[PDB]
């Protein structure tokens, strides 16, 4: 069995990512292309985390 | 002559070989040819079993 994914979901992939995995398996001798994707929903958020505020509130 | 011109000893396995040759095809058990998958069903005794 395999190293799943194990990644850091980074600021770059707000609001929304694409998983897609493949690999070539060469048969007995003939080459195919295995792949699947999934849409992965990222939480919205700023990568400056800017917050406003009345100091006198 | 006597016709064992050839002779032959037994031995103990002193060292492994690499003789396993991997077969990605199907392996008709008995004879261990190896055939490729889409010859499975064939129609055809492609294996000799």
């Given at each position: 069995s395999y190293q799943s994914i194990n990644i850091p979901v980074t600021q770059n992939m707000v609001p929304s990512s694409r998983?897609?995995?493949?690999?070539i398996?060469?048969?007995?001798?003939?080459?195919?292309?295995?792949?699947?994707?999934?849409?992965l929903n990222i939480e919205e958020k700023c990568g400056n985390?800017?917050?406003?505020?009345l100091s006198p509130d | 002559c006597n016709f064992s011109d050839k002779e032959v000893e037994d031995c103990v396995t002193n060292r492994p070989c690499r003789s396993q040759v991997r077969?990605?095809?199907?392996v008709c058990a008995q004879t261990g040819?190896?055939?490729?998958?889409?010859?499975?069903?064939?129609?055809?005794?492609?294996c000799g079993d």
């Open positions: 998983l897609l995995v493949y690999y398996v060469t048969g007995e001798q003939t080459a195919e292309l295995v792949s699947d994707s999934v849409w985390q800017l917050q406003v505020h | 077969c990605e095809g199907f040819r190896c055939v490729n998958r889409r010859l499975l069903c064939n129609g055809d005794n492609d």
